[PDB]
Design an enzyme around this catalytic site. Sequence first.
Site, mmCIF file in Angstrom:
data_model
loop_
_atom_site.group_PDB
_atom_site.id
_atom_site.type_symbol
_atom_site.label_atom_id
_atom_site.label_comp_id
_atom_site.label_asym_id
_atom_site.label_seq_id
_atom_site.Cartn_x
_atom_site.Cartn_y
_atom_site.Cartn_z
ATOM 1 N N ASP A 1 0.815 -1.236 0.000
ATOM 2 C CA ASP A 1 0.000 0.000 0.000
ATOM 3 C C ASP A 1 0.841 1.275 0.000
ATOM 4 O OD1 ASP A 1 -2.244 1.771 0.119
ATOM 5 O OD2 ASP A 1 -2.286 1.679 2.294
ATOM 6 N N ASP B 1 -1.312 5.198 -5.830
ATOM 7 C CA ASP B 1 -1.723 4.314 -4.754
ATOM 8 C C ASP B 1 -1.942 2.859 -5.191
ATOM 9 O OD1 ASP B 1 -2.582 3.228 -2.371
ATOM 10 O OD2 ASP B 1 -4.426 4.398 -2.230
HETATM 11 C C1 LIG Z 1 -5.431 8.184 0.247
HETATM 12 O O1 LIG Z 1 -6.187 6.973 0.165
HETATM 13 C C2 LIG Z 1 -5.691 5.947 1.055
HETATM 14 C C3 LIG Z 1 -6.341 4.624 0.652
HETATM 15 C C4 LIG Z 1 -5.484 3.434 1.021
HETATM 16 O O2 LIG Z 1 -4.608 3.071 -0.054
HETATM 17 C C5 LIG Z 1 -6.345 2.218 1.365
HETATM 18 C C6 LIG Z 1 -5.447 1.054 1.838
HETATM 19 O O3 LIG Z 1 -5.950 -0.248 1.536
HETATM 20 C C7 LIG Z 1 -7.095 -0.767 2.119
HETATM 21 C C8 LIG Z 1 -7.650 -1.942 1.608
HETATM 22 C C9 LIG Z 1 -8.815 -2.468 2.179
HETATM 23 F F1 LIG Z 1 -9.352 -3.592 1.694
HETATM 24 C C10 LIG Z 1 -9.443 -1.828 3.242
HETATM 25 C C11 LIG Z 1 -8.903 -0.655 3.754
HETATM 26 F F2 LIG Z 1 -9.498 -0.044 4.801
HETATM 27 C C12 LIG Z 1 -7.725 -0.130 3.198
HETATM 28 N N1 LIG Z 1 -7.197 1.770 0.280
HETATM 29 C C13 LIG Z 1 -8.507 2.034 0.209
HETATM 30 O O4 LIG Z 1 -9.089 2.689 1.052
HETATM 31 C C14 LIG Z 1 -9.289 1.472 -0.934
HETATM 32 C C15 LIG Z 1 -9.094 0.126 -1.234
HETATM 33 C C16 LIG Z 1 -9.804 -0.458 -2.263
HETATM 34 C C17 LIG Z 1 -9.561 -1.899 -2.570
HETATM 35 O O5 LIG Z 1 -10.470 -2.573 -3.013
HETATM 36 N N2 LIG Z 1 -8.346 -2.389 -2.339
HETATM 37 C C18 LIG Z 1 -7.967 -3.763 -2.618
HETATM 38 C C19 LIG Z 1 -7.106 -4.327 -1.490
HETATM 39 C C20 LIG Z 1 -7.229 -3.806 -3.923
HETATM 40 C C21 LIG Z 1 -6.070 -3.048 -4.147
HETATM 41 C C22 LIG Z 1 -5.407 -3.121 -5.365
HETATM 42 C C23 LIG Z 1 -5.903 -3.936 -6.384
HETATM 43 C C24 LIG Z 1 -7.058 -4.688 -6.181
HETATM 44 C C25 LIG Z 1 -7.715 -4.611 -4.949
HETATM 45 C C26 LIG Z 1 -10.713 0.290 -3.008
HETATM 46 C C27 LIG Z 1 -10.925 1.642 -2.720
HETATM 47 N N3 LIG Z 1 -11.863 2.417 -3.440
HETATM 48 C C28 LIG Z 1 -12.541 3.487 -2.700
HETATM 49 S S1 LIG Z 1 -12.243 2.166 -4.929
HETATM 50 C C29 LIG Z 1 -13.573 1.142 -5.003
HETATM 51 O O6 LIG Z 1 -11.163 1.565 -5.625
HETATM 52 O O7 LIG Z 1 -12.599 3.406 -5.549
HETATM 53 C C30 LIG Z 1 -10.217 2.226 -1.664
HETATM 54 C C31 LIG Z 1 -6.055 6.305 2.476
HETATM 55 O O8 LIG Z 1 -7.231 6.296 2.779
HETATM 56 N N4 LIG Z 1 -5.071 6.623 3.333
HETATM 57 C C32 LIG Z 1 -5.327 7.038 4.702
HETATM 58 C C33 LIG Z 1 -6.127 8.313 4.752
HETATM 59 O O9 LIG Z 1 -5.940 9.179 3.901
HETATM 60 N N5 LIG Z 1 -7.019 8.447 5.743
HETATM 61 C C34 LIG Z 1 -7.845 9.641 5.891
HETATM 62 C C35 LIG Z 1 -9.302 9.226 5.882
HETATM 63 C C36 LIG Z 1 -9.872 8.702 4.727
HETATM 64 C C37 LIG Z 1 -11.217 8.331 4.739
HETATM 65 C C38 LIG Z 1 -11.988 8.474 5.901
HETATM 66 C C39 LIG Z 1 -11.425 9.004 7.057
HETATM 67 C C40 LIG Z 1 -10.083 9.388 7.039
HETATM 68 C C41 LIG Z 1 -4.083 7.279 5.560
HETATM 69 C C42 LIG Z 1 -3.732 6.012 6.313
HETATM 70 C C43 LIG Z 1 -2.882 7.845 4.829
#
Ligand SMILES: CO[C@H](C[C@H](O)[C@H](COc1cc(F)cc(F)c1)NC(=O)c1cc(C(=O)N[C@H](C)c2ccccc2)cc(N(C)S(C)(=O)=O)c1)C(=O)N[C@H](C(=O)NCc1ccccc1)C(C)C
EC number: 3.4.23.46
Length: 373
Positions: free
Chosen positions: A35, A220
């Site tokens: 990731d 990502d």
């Molecule tokens: C900037 O975006 C990143 C996203 C990450 O890369 C995370 C890390 O990986 C996972 C995988 C999971 F199965 C569950 C999970 F909870 C996380 N990824 C995702 O959130 C994510 C995973 C997936 C997803 O299906 N991932 C699987 C594992 C995958 C990866 C690669 C190839 C095939 C499958 C999908 C999505 N989408 C929304 S989508 C449908 O594609 O449009 C998002 C992120 O959210 N980072 C965090 C963040 O920014 N948090 C702030 C926040 C966000 C939302 C709400 C509150 C706070 C910090 C830790 C840095």
Amino acid sequence: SFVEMVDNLRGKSGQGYYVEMTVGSPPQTLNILVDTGSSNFAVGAAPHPFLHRYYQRQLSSTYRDLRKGVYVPYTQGKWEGELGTDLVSIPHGPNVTVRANIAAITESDKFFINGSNWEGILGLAYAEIARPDDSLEPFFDSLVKQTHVPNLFSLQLCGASVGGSMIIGGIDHSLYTGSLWYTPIRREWYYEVIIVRVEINGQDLKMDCKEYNYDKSIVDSGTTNLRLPKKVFEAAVKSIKAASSTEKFPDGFWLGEQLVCWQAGTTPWNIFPVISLYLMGEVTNQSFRITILPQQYLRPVESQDDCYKFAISQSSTGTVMGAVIMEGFYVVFDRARKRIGFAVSACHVHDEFRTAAVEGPFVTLDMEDCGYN
Ligand SMILES: CO[C@H](C[C@H](O)[C@H](COc1cc(F)cc(F)c1)NC(=O)c1cc(C(=O)N[C@H](C)c2ccccc2)cc(N(C)S(C)(=O)=O)c1)C(=O)N[C@H](C(=O)NCc1ccccc1)C(C)C
């Protein structure tokens, strides 16, 4: 050696790319989701219906409790756990063991995926976005500080179940063709880049280039889709819809809620456009483009029908260049030189008359106006 690291990634289609790692003494083998959108190394450490194994801290003689809780939110899900440190190695990585921070996941919501075969997450981005704060050193920072592994890693994600390579500490030239094209890492938090132009079947989307990077654009590996800001997403779907207006789709398909199916081997790839993302280059007024085929953004969902999901989706937190983008390319995360390299990978997806391409140089004036502040 780099050959030992080739083919070190596995996964199920649409469920994530993972690398094998060991935590503790004696070593406990776990599959770890690669990731680049986060900075926390975390593993399942308590029984979970979707987990077949987990980290058992009581079985490790080198486990140190840090006596501090942690929660990490992501777009798709979240988990909380307990911070600690332990000895970590990567069997098909560099021949080294490091003491690194590990978050022992005790509970989670929509984090683990059923049947995905990974039990943890390796956050490869920078300390700035690490939880609880930037004082928790990310794994890769610990690796570089404790060993002579160069401050660089590359990812070759092979879609087309799923496989690829994470070359740790370098670039394996047999994994890509042509030349590498580099875009600056704008800021060291996420792997932030600047998109300066978007074309769909050679037609400029003609939006203000700030819209493409509103409020950020990141690379990502942990996200499946090419995620686009609202305005850009709507302009993209409108073009892709126009280009494929010959065929019948429920409009819930364009939202990724329903699938489209075709008599096996009769998928009309020709009617879906190629998408070119132009990225800021290394020199003044210079960019390069990466072109993706519909085979990247129409993802096969497993009757003798070929069924697909629309894997371009909307975002309110900026552009996310997910697996849809990365699967066509050998992606170099050159941390030492603050740049990200793209080259057409050896495992690129095949169209009969079109190719995924990394091309340059291009002229682009006022590229610094494309970054959002
Ligand atoms: C900037 O975006 C990143 C996203 C990450 O890369 C995370 C890390 O990986 C996972 C995988 C999971 F199965 C569950 C999970 F909870 C996380 N990824 C995702 O959130 C994510 C995973 C997936 C997803 O299906 N991932 C699987 C594992 C995958 C990866 C690669 C190839 C095939 C499958 C999908 C999505 N989408 C929304 S989508 C449908 O594609 O449009 C998002 C992120 O959210 N980072 C965090 C963040 O920014 N948090 C702030 C926040 C966000 C939302 C709400 C509150 C706070 C910090 C830790 C840095």
